[PDB]
Amino acid sequence: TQKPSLYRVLILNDDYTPMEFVVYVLERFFNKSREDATRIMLHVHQNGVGVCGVYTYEVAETKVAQVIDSARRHQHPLQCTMEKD
Ligand SMILES: [Mg+2]
């Protein structure tokens, strides 16, 4: 049997990226509702890290890349990474 092997995408808190931009990232790249995006945004602000979604490895890599691309082009240092789920 092929067991599941999925990967969670994380964002890390920083003191520079605006809250509104994080909500945007979550809505756009992780299909979060405004409320759910706000929820995750606040969790990351308070606790340092949060889960954006869980995907197959290649899809997780794609989302991490899209977030970093978007963040840097918007002049924000937002860190996005992935880990085995
Ligand atoms: Mg697990």
3-state SS, one letter per residue, for 18-67: CHHHHHHHHHHHHCCCHHHHHHHHHHHHHHCEEEEEEECHHHHHHHHHHH
Give the Å distance between the CA of 85 and the centre of ligand 1: 4
Query: Domain spans of the chain?
Result: 1-85
- Cβ neighbours of residue 4 closer than 8 Å, sequence gap 6 or more: none
Looking at 3.30.200.20, 3.40.50.1370, 3.40.50.10440, 3.30.1390.10, the CATH number of the domain 1-85 comes to 3.30.1390.10
Q: Which structure tokens are listed for 13?
A: 């808190």
* Closest-CA residue to 48 (of 21, 19, 10, 2): 10
Q: How far is the CA of 35 from the centre of ligand 1 (A)?
A: 25
CA 11–ligand 1 middle distance (angstroms): 18
Q: Is 65 exposed, middle or buried (0-12, 13-18, 19+ CB in 10 A)?
A: exposed
Per the entry, the structure determination technique was: X-ray
Bridge partners of 11, per DSSP, are 50, 80
The angstrom resolution of this structure is 1.5
Distance 29 CA to ligand 1 centre (A): 22
Q: Are 80 and 67 in contact (CB under 8 A)?
A: yes
